[PDB]
Design a protein around this ligand. Structure first.
Ligand SMILES: Cc1cc2nc3c(=O)[nH]c(=O)nc-3n(C[C@H](O)[C@H](O)[C@H](O)COP(=O)(O)O)c2cc1C
Ligand SMILES: Cc1cc2nc3c(=O)[nH]c(=O)nc-3n(C[C@H](O)[C@H](O)[C@H](O)COP(=O)(O)O)c2cc1C
Lengths: 207, 207
């Protein structure tokens, strides 16, 4: 199988729990699957121009017989590169922190590139239908406070954002590994983090 | 007063409801407050490097007085420029669409830059307290579908995102003008858009 790892954090593992989690899942995945093709995409090593008018118009027009501007075609070429790589993968693993309630803006731009009629969803008379139902997806997230319960739960917009968009694209039975609360309950941080790394190992073995 | 308009959509006004909404609020605000200083910040005209390790380490180390690498110092300086402008404004008006459930990634990066201990919030033994209580904020949003009720209400992450972060910074009694449902209910689009632009004019006249 071809497996794409999308890394959305360039902090060192020693300082960033989401990075420690991503690296553990990655190492465990490779150990269990020596003959898979595993590809890492580090969003901080890429040039990710923000989506705006030229990308919106270019991706709408592409393939429909319209003229494109040079700038529209440049924008389409960027989105196509990421979109085609994502579509080629049999499994996709996203590793990201919660920062300021949500995902890193680098990952927000990457997911914007994935939204394309005819590629990740199609229109029907009954509404949009997702086209990635055959892809296995894992979401690996770390967050300092607890967001699964308590007063912050209603403003969690990191895992919720990625799961909502992947669900729209048609992904089902996504796996999620979440390490939360290590900043909020610092006395238990070591055990909270270790427990997440164990869970990552178990999920990666079956993924 | 000094009023900062933050524009997050470079589609022409003829093709974009959120840009009509922004331009109507802007024109009406100026007409009604001819002697106020109005400054427009067009996020698509700016260079907005993504937040990652250099910004994070840079702001952490600046707070400690530790030496900054070139890249850390440059990152802090970029954030400073935008943060200082936001802090100097008496009122701030944000104009943005809902794209892919959320705000444009350009506005996501902009808001990331505003988060700073001692500037937009401070720590207390009882938890963080926001420091912008004095600042009047308007949120102008357009969205194709209805997100105020129905099956999609649960995944609105555009207005909810900006309102949550501004609230954390301590903004109170923010004004919100939303134009929603013009793509979902095309038979009502003319009425919905016209009503929304009238509301923006009214709110701007009193802002
Ligand atoms: C820029 C930034 C913003 C953050 N925002 C939040 C937040 O909104 N809520 C929270 O509980 N923790 C927040 N944290 C703490 C992180 O969620 C925590 O460190 C988690 O491990 C993911 O970040 P990391 O993998 O980079 O360490 C933030 C950390 C950083 C560096
Ligand atoms: C790139 C893009 C993504 C969009 N995503 C959504 C969406 O998730 N939900 C929705 O109801 N409408 C969506 N729309 C429609 C816009 O919310 C809406 O109709 C209005 O166009 C805001 O976009 P605008 O001000 O640029 O026109 C999207 C439009 C664009 C161009």
């Amino acid at each position: 199988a071809t497996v794409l790892f999308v890394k959305a954090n360039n902090r060192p593992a020693e300082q960033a729990v989401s990075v420690k989690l991503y690296e553990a899942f990655l190492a465990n995945y490779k150990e269990a699957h020596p003959n898979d093709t595993v590809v890492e995409l580090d969003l901080y090593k890429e040039e990710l121009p923000y989506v705006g008018v030229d990308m919106i118009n270019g991706t709408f027009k592409a393939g429909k017989g319209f003229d494109l501007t040079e700038e529209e075609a440049k924008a389409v070429a960027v989105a196509d590169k990421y979109l085609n790589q994502f579509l080629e993968a049999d499994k996709v693993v996203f590793g990201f922190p919660l920062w300021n309630l949500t995902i890193p803006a680098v990952l927000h731009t990457y997911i914007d590139y994935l939204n394309r009629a005819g590629k990740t969803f199609k229109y029907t008379p009954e509404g949009p239908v997702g086209l990635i139902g055959d892809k296995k997806i894992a979401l690996l997230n770390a967050r300092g406070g607890v967001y699964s319960e308590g007063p912050a739960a209603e403003v969690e917009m990191a895992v919720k954002y990625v799961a909502s968009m992947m669900g729209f694209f048609g992904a089902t039975n996504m796996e999620t590994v979440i390490i939360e609360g290590h900043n909020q309950f610092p006395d238990k941080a070591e055990e909270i983090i270790a427990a997440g790394l164990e869970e990552a190992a178990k999920v990666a073995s079956k993924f």
